[model samples]
Structures are given as structure tokens and as C-alpha cells.
Target chain A: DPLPFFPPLYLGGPEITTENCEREPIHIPGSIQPHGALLTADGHSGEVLQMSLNAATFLGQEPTVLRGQTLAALLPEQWPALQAALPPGCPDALQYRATLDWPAAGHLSLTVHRVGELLILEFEPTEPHALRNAMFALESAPNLRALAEVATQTVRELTGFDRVMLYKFAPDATGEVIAEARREGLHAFLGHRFPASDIPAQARALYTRHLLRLTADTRAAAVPLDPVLNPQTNAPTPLGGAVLRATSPMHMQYLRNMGVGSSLSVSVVVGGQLWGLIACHHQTPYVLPPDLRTTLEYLGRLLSLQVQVKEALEH
Target chain B: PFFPPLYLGGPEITTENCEREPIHIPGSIQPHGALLTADGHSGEVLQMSLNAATFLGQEPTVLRGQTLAALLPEQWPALQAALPPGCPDALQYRATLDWPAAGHLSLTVHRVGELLILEFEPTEAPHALRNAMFALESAPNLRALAEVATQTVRELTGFDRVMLYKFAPDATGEVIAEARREGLHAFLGHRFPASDIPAQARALYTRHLLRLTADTRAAAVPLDPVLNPQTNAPTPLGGAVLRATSPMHMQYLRNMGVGSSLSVSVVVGGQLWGLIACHHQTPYVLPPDLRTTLEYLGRLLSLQVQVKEALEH
Candidate 1:
């Protein structure tokens, strides 16, 4: 068998405990996950310090060629106010975002945030078919039930997952599938209650930090990080900005158990804290560029806020 | 070295078109947490992480090949209940446990990739038999917080009885704190089995913060096609406002001599640490406004639980 770069968790190994694992560093992987590109540059100089392992495709240059060069040379069209746009008063690790008029491939969205003395620029295309209509539909939902229903259906149309669920986490972190949109024949995990352990604290923390996680195929090989560390910091290249931050094999194995070949999850955060998730799953493998994921994340935030409003209004 | 985007599936490991990158595996634990991996079938510990050695008081080498039960013998029932039968694929169970070294640990048992991954976080500190004076000199230890929650919840909902129910590590529940009206006998320290609220049902506390039983034996309004017409299955009602209550649970409540109940879960970190179990001696129905108010209070209780743990530790 052509084993992916990382083999599945071999049976029979010492196990991890809940106390120590609660803070799993699932987000700080030096490598990228394979969905998009990441570039971290000098906060002031704009010199590219690191690129995600698979950053070449977007830059039209090799990974080696991309490093050490100025991020401006790579995308001169959007470099005018790189650091200026990272305005102060913004909280640490919060994303300051913009959309590129065009990339070599197509239009792209850029999100920039700072870490110490570096600026992380994340690039993903807006995609050909956008969620403009999905946004409007979500705006029109009269109440929570209708909102969940419309939102679930909207994601199905956007990502083509076999089953898309509007899942809400309770205080205990266990998840309940609130609303669903799926293929006609299959009776997916429609109303089933998923255990909180399905998405451990570490993964849940990432959803709060980064808003989205997308994998085209659960079984596909995970691409390793290029350089693995920042040349300057000598620390692990922070992946909070990378679109392709590699995922844990345990998480992958979790999806494999659910019979999910591919999946995308968008965080619905309210009050700057995670409130719920838009969990989309596909029985067969699926992949897409960043534009849709970004839009869905924004839309999920909108729904998250709306959910709070509904709850507050009821109170 | 790497693979290109294959429509059928990205070049999983396609070497011809691209280069190889480090793959991140979701197999590591965070700080102060312990990890355990066991065979799904035999419940034997296949491997234990280094930190696990610290929690189990065993060398990683020595812990291998032992059943999860050997370590925490009392939890043999809950651990087995959470991880047993067939290897659960992509499922998780949350419970509390009293380990040999770690006094009160929050146990999160997750089944993934043909093995059971057990995580233990110190949610409560080990308690020693202290002097009576120290026991009385408390500022919101867990019990104090529980009492505050009982008084606050009853006031908000105007219910006849409110009790802060704590789950013993092995799936049993105790009435730790309570506020009750006259004529109702106090269930101040009654114990119930893990079967009272099974693992699957307890797991609901994570996503569904609060649950209400308007009448113990009330009929649940039907939910057709799970709110999605094309599908026909028992729709997940974990989030629905009007979702039906479990029939067994209803009978359990009916048998408990409760007219109605409002059970809210207090989750510490991500696991179902325990519950704020509210009962009404008479049929109790809270209005939407009161329900929302109590839910918000439940949020505070969740926070208080976290703070109380930190203080206790």
C-alpha cells in the first residue's frame, strides 16, 4: 500500500491522558496542511522569512526561491501599505484582512496579522463561485431554526459535502447536530449526538484562533513544512496564518471512523469566543481553494453573532 | 517529493508532481494533561506517554500491555462503559475519576483510529482530612460555588428544588448541594448509578448546555424528517429548543417522584464535569424569559466551576 507520508496510528502504543492533552498544540505545527499557502515576513522590512511547505503554487516560484525575497516582489500589486494596514489597537493575533484584485491564478483574499517582529500574510483566492447569495440567505432567516436550516443548505451548495451539519456545542463540549443538508439516500449523522472528544480541546482552540480547517481527502498524504522553523526566530514557524497547517493523524483517524473522506469545519465564534461550528462532511474526497472557506468563516461569524442576538432577545 | 491536486483526491503522496512536507498528526496532548492509548477490543494499554507515567506513577515501559482498569480499578466500570463494546470509531466520552496519585481527574475517553485515547486533566485537587477550622474557612471552594448555584438557579427559575449534582469518577452522581421547599424530603446525599444518565446521554451536556422537562411524562412534539424533508432518521435534538426528551429518562424522573425537572450541565474545559440537576416537587414550567435567564446563569456557573477548580488546585 502507498502509505501517506505519515502512517496511520499504529496499534498498541502508550496512550495520552486528558489532563496533559487538553492543551494539545494542534495549531503550532511548523508545516502547512496542504489547502493553501502561508508567508511570514519581517514586520517592517516585508522580507519573506518563511513560506508554507506548499507555497510555490501561488507565487509562481519555487519554495526556495520565494524565501529571503521581499513579499512585495511576490505580490507588488498589494504591497503598498503592508505594515500600515496592521493598525495598532487591534488585539494580538486578530486578523487584519483584505482581498487581492488578482493573483497569478485568480482573485485572492489576504489576511495579515503580527507575531513578535513578523507579519504573517495568508493568501487564498475568492474562488469563481462565491457565497454572495449564501450571505443574503443567511441574512433573511427569521429565527434560529430557520437560520440553521438555511445555513446548512447554503454550505451544502457551497462545498458539496455529502452531509453538512449545523452543529452546536454544549457547555460540556459535546456536539449536537442541529440542522442538516445531505444527499438524498443516505441517513447520515442527522440528529446523532457526537461526543466532545470528537474535537478535543486542542482542535477546538484552533477553531477559535483560526476560523477554518479544510481537507480535500482525509487519507491523502500530509505535506510537511518547508524549513520547519523560522530562519530568524529558530522557533517553529507559527501556522496560525497558514491555510495548510498539517492536522493530527488522530484527528484524521477520527474522520476515517465517521466514514468521512473529506471535510471542512468553520468556527462560529461569538463574543470573541467559540460558540459553535459549521461541520461539513463528504463521503468521498473533496477539495477547494481558500475563497469559499474564508467566506464561510465570515458567514459563520455572522451566524454566531446572530445566534447570540437571538438568545439575548429571548432573554 | 510531493503531490499535486488530484480531483479524485489530492495527490495523497504523489511524488512526481510535487515535494514532501511534514505531516502534522493529531496525537499529542497539552500541558498538565496525561495520555493513554489502548486496544479498542481488549481495553489493554498499548502505549502510554511520558507524562502518563507521572499521572499513573508507573514507568512508561511498565504501564504498557495493562488494561485501562488495572490503573484505576474503581473506574473499571465507567472506563469500560466509555471505551468498551466495539472499538468506538470517532466517538468521545467525558467523566470524572479519582486516580491513585491524581486525586480528582477529569477523564476524556476518545476512540479514534482503532484505539482508545485517554486524557486526564486535574480538575480538582487532592483533599486531605483537614482540621474543622480550615474546612469552615472557605471562600467559594467547589461546594460553596455549588450552593451559590443552587440558590441562584432556584431564585431565577422559582423552582421548588435545586441541587448541584456532582458525578463521582465511576459514573455515579451525588447530591452535593441542594435548596428545597417544605414538604419535599431532601435528597441531600442520595446516590444514583451511571446508568441513571448513561455515557451517551451525559455527552449531551457538552453541546446542549441546558435541558428542561416541562412535565415528567409529557409527550414530545414530533420532529418530522429531522427538519430536513429528504432524510428520515432520529434527528439529533441536542440543539433543538423543542426536542423530545428520552422516554427512559422520563420514566426515571417519574420514578424519582419529580413532577418536572430542569437539568443544566456544567462542563469544565471540554468534558461533562458534573451537572446542575434541578427538580420541582410540583409540575414546574418556566417561561421563555426565565429559561433564557437561567441559561445565562448556567454560563456563569460554568465559569465558576473553572475558577473553583483553579482555586482548589
Candidate 2:
């Protein structure tokens, strides 16, 4: 949807690993979050079978009420583009950029993809923000820590998260929060050693696919899809790259236990095997639209390049 | 019989993806050696090669759930010294250990994934080592050195193809010398892009000096069912001698039409300068003793690189 994350496809390299590290279930996150909404209809039937908790807000109908409705009933205007953008077969998510207008959220950007038999769609309100300064901050940075310094502060300032951390990964996938920018009195996770359990390997793999994931509110009830089965295979749709993809229940508890209400992660890729993360945490529910993520996504990529340059120069 | 290319579909990964590909956690290595992963603290064996029984007379099953005490109890200090905060200076340290029922071993202890990976390569006799050292003197200049290397390595390993590859400052590679049996392509003087061998793989080249993908078509022997038996997770075989080939890499060789391949790192000044790549049209595996000889040859080249750099300039 966005120009794809740093590594857009699953690498054929060293992927058949048998490592036992707890790779988090970032894909097939089963449900769309409330801050954003996802909808899926049978491209063949046009009947809605998958609708997230926030689907009603977009459809102006309750979850139960919208489950069986045809695609034409939700947004009669945008249905054509959504279906046309669908990919033909497995492991493909064809993105079609369109807009759906909502009063409270302004104009929501509609992003769609296909997995198995489902035609999944996500809606995010687009806020126009120029990222000139974010790019400027990234380019002006000096060293490794200084580069992360600008990124964390810029992301925190832009997203209004309670805290922002730049976490660099160790060889074992454990991370050290090397840099931080936070609101006053926030407990500093700076220098905190996050166990490999926090951003496990599979999660790392997904981050390389979708650069950013926003949890609207951790405590929100998960919306399950109706029928959840493909007519062709009878298996539930594989929810890769789904904007409404829910966080793992364990990850939800992990945040709740840490007292974090919402979180976002942007990958800073150097040579693709996850160099670090621009981690954002909020004490209250934080809603993020695609544009701000796009801004940070752009900044995250710039930081990745600068990191390699500095690292190469030193070596 | 023919096979389709294994890694042609993944065009999404650019050379940058490879440049950043993490070589440290490849989770597998080529075959012919044994790998033992012991707990860094107590030296208890958490995992070991499936072939440990052949080398140590103790099956990996027995090796697992045991301690380094079985082989050398006092080896912990060297193992600990080779760990991080100190070991990156010398990523590995060599030690001589008296094998319990087997012969003497040249133990290579390095830290990997919170575990100490110990590689036990048999030590060559003193005369053999002396002869290996003596062979390095005749090759004076860079061209002579590479030509000598190609000839000598071909004689030792008997692979269908043997080539001396040199890396430019840009990370591209050029074949400087070549020796091959009939039907082998003339790859000498061919230039390859930096993407041909990704950065992390080269990092391993720097650390290990030799890699043997003994059989491309053979399925990699998994260290599981013994190691990580509980979780079925794999220990990183970055330090293993018998780690399996990546399917993508296996495919790259398949494309080159070589049924087996072996590589010895050519390091200069503690960095990977290039490689001595070996290819066989048939599934050829190197014997342990011959691999040791190749490893010694690699060491000779590393020593000579500094000398070659000076006289040529």
C-alpha cells in the first residue's frame, strides 16, 4: 500500500530456520483494531463475511447487522475500486488507493488487499502533513545515537505519544532502548533491555513487510469475522498486511502489564534484518492515521540509510 | 534430469537486503564437521551435531543433557574469554583438548546465541602442519600465489572446478586463477556483482575461513530431535561444520551447474579479502583431513595477503 516496507517480500535467504526463539504472531492478528476499520466481502458473492469492531462506525451499522450485508450497502460509491484492486490468488495483497468520507474522521483512505478468498479493506483518515522538517532532522543527524535521537524526538513530537524510544536490536534479537523522548514524568524505558519476547522474530519479519503497525487502543474488544472460511479452501483468511490486524493477545497483556495503552513500531532497516525500531508508547489510547505513519515511515527509511553510512565509515 | 532454479522468484530483495542480511544467525552451516552448543555458564551441552557420535563416541543424545566436563572440564575459561565484551577482539580462541575416547582435537570456542559453540576439528600431526607451512613459500607475487593456490587446492580436494576469487574494494569479485576438469565453464576473468555473495555470508567467510556445502541436492541434516528437542528450535549453525545449505544458495549453485561447492575464505589483515571457491559437477564431499589442509592453506593465504599487498604496490 505504502511503497512497501524496507523488505517487501519474504526473503528466500536463511528463512528455513529452526531457531526456537519466540517469534510473535504479527500476521493473522485475527481482527481489525477500533482506531481503524477493516471489511472483507466475497469478491464472488459481494456479501460481507468479515467485519471488525469498528466496522459499524464506517458502515453506520452494527457489527451483527453489517456481517451479511453486500458490499454495495457499505459504501456504494467505493465498492467498484475495492473489488477491481483485488489480487487473483494466494500470498498477494494488491493495494488500491481510494477515499471514503466520514464526518468525525474526515476523509478516510481506503486500502485493500486479498488473501485466499477474502477481499480485505482498511480505512484510515488522511491528514495532510508536510514532512520537510522530519527529513531535515534525519539528514542533519550525526552519529548512530544522534541519528536515533532525532528520530525518537521527531516521532514523539508528531504522534503525540507519551514516550518514544529508539531500540537497537542485539544479535540474539534482544533490544536495548538506546534513545528516548518522552512527556514529563514518564518512566524512562531508556536503557531498558527488552527481552526477545517483546518484538519476536516473526514480528520482525512482518515489520519488514509492513513498516508500521498502530494499535488504536489495546483494551478495545477484538472483532471476529463471520464464517471466517474460504469457500474454496474452507480455511480462515491469512491476515497478512491487514491494517485491522489485531495484536496478539499475549502482546496485548504485555502492554497492559507494562501499563501501555497503545503502541506503534516503525522499522529502521539497515540491510533488512531489522537493525532497530522507532518504538512509540502512550499511556492513553493513541489513534494514528496513515499520513503520520507515512511521515514516520519516510523518516524511518532515511535513518536506515544514514545508519549504514556511519557504520560503514567507522568500519 | 534437470531442476528449476530455486531462488529466481525473490526479485523484491535488492542487493541492499543482502548487504544487511544477518549472516551471524544463518542457523545452519555446510556439512562435514560437528557442532556443540553448551550453556555459556556451566558448559552443559544444550545441543550438539547429529553426528557427534561419529566424532566423540558420544551420541548427540548423550552429549545433550551433559556438560563440557565430559571432554575437558577446565576449558570454561577459554570459552568464557571468547564471549562478548572481550571475544569480538578474537571471535574465537583455539585450545587443544584430549578427547575422551577419540584423538586430540583443535577446539574452537566462540559465543553464539547465549551459548558457547565449540567446534572440535582433529589436530593434524606436526609433520603435516610443517609441510602445509612449507608450501606457502614458493608463491611470491599475487598472480603466482593464486595460480599456486588453484593448482594445490585442486590436487588436494579433486573437485571438478577450482578457482581463486579476489574481491575488489567495491565488494565485486573476479576469478584470478582457474583449474577445472573437462566440461567445466571458463569462469576465469569473469566479474561478479557484490550481490553474488551477500554481506553477512562474507562476514562468515571472515570468521570461519572455510565453508563446505558438501552436497547441494542432499537435504540438510537438522540438529533438532537432539538439540532444541523440546522446542524443536534450531541453534544457529553459524559455527557448525555440517549446517545445511540455504535453498536459495543451493539454487544458486544449481544454476552454476555444480552439484557440490566448497569455499575457503581468503582473509587479509583480519578482514575477508576474497575466497577460494571450489565446485564439483558431481556430489563431492571433502574428507575431514583434507578440509583441515584447505583450512591451513587459507591461513597461509591470510598471512601472505599482507606480503602480497606490499610487493605488488
Candidate 3:
């Protein structure tokens, strides 16, 4: 019998033992984590479970009941609202947050999202005073430029990010940095131009495919497929299962070249097309927990709506 | 004193040696119709003829007995008031009046010493009027269109002076095209000062679109609420009061030495491009139906102007 030659792992992160690897999926909490987590399932009777636990204490119920007995039940009510908010004929996954009153707690912020047939929801206690004050500042801005600047500043302050930028795309697909908000020591990308090739057709096409794309650590390489699997089919082998490789190699490389270790970008679409992106970069490896990612994505959706409304009003 | 010689075919013929007796020209020699004049103060028919009664669909004796005011409907008080004071001894005058049955009637009033000679003529027919309007539509350029516009208005309305008033890029305007009826004063090449049409007045012109002044002396129509209470629709009535009625505006024009006036807006690309102004030394009304026709013609003229401008650019 020939001895098996194990390939080297491409990922660069904290090492995990074989036992730890087997137990990884079980380690995820059934309820949402403090950072935020939403889980949904397909089929008619499936349940869309949502909960929030900050470190230890639960802000509200373990899982608040929604319209669905299962995930599919809620789609009828939620799908129309989501479809109306997005551009016409868009079938990709969508996400956003809504603030509502909690049964037990006074007020709770709920982050809602859909991936395929799954309608994910997460809830957390919100500081109404802070949100109201920030929103007041935004509403009082005189013009679009000032509004964007104020929004960028508020988002940076709330997220504690190293840099936040408002990027606008030209008709030709090239992007120009229109506004920027960064900490004292950060380098500014304002007025910088990016080639259309930076985000190619394929990459932009992927945005409509996935609701969110997050890389906690850019240096991490992909896990390999099992040997017994059929290469053409990309199916798992009988004895062991295979994992898919990360799909954003060019993006990872581009970020790495730019000296950024972590990034969170949300797409802003207008008129059924990719209008621009709101990019937030972190100097160190930063993994946004599910809750934070949902919040940011929701905020991006609101901002996109605001921009369109302002433009229409201006005309 | 000797009368000046009348020139015919480049040869001067002295009237001095001709027979001085009053000569009666044949009725067939008269071109169209003539006008009957009435005394304003005495309410007398100073000048009247059987020809006028034949065209007016009334008897000659009946017309002579009735005052001009009584012959006309009460609505036309301006025409009744324009009659000469105390009736002149058979004077040659011109008067235009609207007959409810015949539409518009124009006559040349002549006083051959004591006999008042009145001749009646028919206005232009609708078919000829429409053909003239079609010709304006096919005009090749602005200059040609302007000429057609002035000529058509002068002929159709029988006004003494007609001109196409084109507004410049600035507030100023000039008479770019002109046509005059026979015996009317010539203002073809004359230019008025720019102050004639100030910015405020031009603004109003653009705002309102069309204006007409029949008698410069009559009170203006006042502006009331646009909506009619009974019908609940916009009443097309020219309001109860005249802010600038035909009569008052006519007086203003005549004070500028312009008589009867009719101005139709020429709009291009939804902007006021120019105006077609018709004037007469005698008071006249461009009938409502005729005004509507001219407005449509004016729109076609505007399109021609735009086409010409596009070609030049």
C-alpha cells in the first residue's frame, strides 16, 4: 500500500487540532451570538429563528416568534417589501434591519436578511437616544455632499473603523472616491481613482449573487478537496467530504497589495445596476461577527435609498 | 390755384384742362363696396346709399331713418361712438362693422358734395383664407414666412398697417416684415426705439400669449376669477373688467400713432419667438373666429422660423 501524502493547509490563522475541526460546526450557538447571528431554512414549515446574546446576557427572548412557523412561512409577507425596496427583477439575496418593539424588552433592533429560501433574522437591544441623535444630524444636512460626509463620519464613529469611504461609480464603471472618514493616523483615499478592472464584470456579477462577502483574515488560504471526490462534479468522496475554495482570489490579492488585512464592503445599487460600493477597511485582521455584518449591510441599504430620494428631490 | 397733375403710365396729364363738371362713374367701375357714415351727435345718417342696404339685407329708406347705433346691436357701442361730431357734409370716411348675420362688413364712405355714397363689399371667403394660411406653412424661410404673415394679416383683416414684430435675444424688438393697404401711411423701413417694448411689458406678452385692441378709447376688461361659478369650468369670457381691453390698448397704440391693433403670439419651442401686429387708422375688430384662424397660422409661421434657424445654424 502506498503511503498518503497530506497537502499543506493554505489558511493563515490560529491552528486547530483535528478534534477541534470535527467539533467546529457544533460550537456555533443555536441562538444568535452577541455580535449577531441569523439562521433560516427552506421548505414550507421551516422556522426562521432569531435571538441576540451580547457576550452572556440575552437582550430579549431566546427566539422571538415571527410570521413563519418555518422560514418559508415568513417569505410571503417579507418578500414583497424586500422586492419593492430593491431594483426591479433582482433575484439575489437581500438583507436589512428594522427596529420594532419587543414583547418583553421595551425596544429591540431586528436585522433581517434572506439567502436563497432562507430568511435570517437577529435581534438586539438598541440605544434609541444615540441613534436618534445621529439621525437628527443627518436629516439637518443642507445638501447631498454634506449629507454623505455626515453619514460617513457617523458610520465611522459608530463602527470604530480605521477608514470609511463613500465611493461613486462613473457611467464607465470606474469608481472615484467622493468622501472619506478616517482616524487621525490613517491614510486618506479621497479623490483617488480606481480602474474599472479593479472590480471586473465577474466580480460585480458576484455581488448580485451573494448578499455579503466577508474575509476575516485576507491571508487565509483555501481548504483542499478530498481525493476520492470526482474532480469534474466537485462532489464529496464516500469516506470524507470536501470543502470549496474561496472564490475571491483577485479581490484578496488587490486588498493585500493595498496593505489592508481586513475589509467589509456593501453594494449600493441604483436603477437595477451596481451604482457604487461603501468600503470600510481595517489595518489589522478584523472578523465582523454575524450581528455586526447584518447591521452594516442594513445601514448601507438605507443610505442607498436616501441617496436616490435626495437626487430625485433635487431635480 | 391750379390742381396738381395726375400721373398715369409715366405721362403727366393736367386736370386743369379737363371738364370740371361732376361726373357720375358707372357702378360697374366701383371695385367692391362703400361705407355709410352717421352723425355721432345728431344721430343722423350723414351718408347712406342703396348699395349699403343691398349688402346689409335691409331697405335703403329704413337704414336712412334709423341711427347707426339703432342699426347695430348694443354690444358695439365703440363703433357707434366713433361717428364724427354733428355729421360732416358728405365726407369721405372709412368704417368697419360686424353684422350679426353677415359676419364682417367694411365700407368706404364718400361724400360727393351732398349725396352720401355708400358701397358694400364681401369679406374674404374661408377657402381663400385657408389657402393663404397653407402658403404660410410651406414658407421656405423666416423672411419669407414673415412676408406671408404680414400680407395675409393685412389682407384678411383689411388693416392699414401690418408688421411682423420679431423680438431679439435682448428685450428689444423690430418690425422685420411689413405690408400696408393702399393709401395707408408707410412704416415699412421705419424703426421704433427699443423702449417701446420694455422688459416688464414683454414679460406680460409672453405670459398672456395673445392681445387685441379694437378701439384705443374703450375701457379695458377687468380680470376676475378664471373659473365660472355656474359651469365650474374656466370661463373663456374676457372678464367683466378690462385690465387692457382692445379699446384702451388701441388708444395706447394710436397714441404711438398706431390705430386698430391685433397682435398674435408666435411661439417656438414653447417660447415667445415674435409677434404679428396688425394696425389700422380706423377702428376695427379682428373677429373671434378670424383671430383663432390667425393664431393657428401664427403657429405654423413659428415652425417655419424654427426650421430656418436650424438650417442657418
Candidate 2 local lDDT, B4-75, one digit each (tens): 112222233333454543333344444455677777667777766566677777755667778776557677
lDDT of 3 by residue, B1-313 (tens): 2222121112232233222211111111121233444444434554443345446877657765687456655423533332233433222233455665567764433222223333344553333343353345445577877887788787777778888887777646677899987876666655665555544345445534455655665443221222223333322222111123322233357666654567777765545777888777766656444654564556446545665677667
User: TM-score of every model?
Assistant: 0.45, 0.44, 0.32
What candidate 1 gets wrong by more than 4 Å, as runs, is A1-23, A87-93, A96-110, A124-142, A313-315, B1-313
lDDT (10s digit) by residue, model 2, range A63-168: 7777757878766886775565353553343345565677656777777666656677787667611244344335445567777787788787788888889889
DockQ of 2: 0.01
Per-model DockQ against the true two-chain complex: 0.01, 0.01, 0.01
lDDT of 1: 0.60
lDDT of 2 at B167: 89
Error of 2 at B73 (Å): 76
lDDT for model 2, please: 0.65
Window of ten residues with lowest summed lDDT in model 3 chain A: A236-245
Candidate 3 deviant stretches above 4 angstroms? A1-128, A208-212, A223-247, A313-315, B1-313
In candidate 3 the C-alpha lDDT for residue A72 amounts to: 38
Q: On a 0 to 100 scale, what is the lDDT of residue A148 in model 3? A: 81
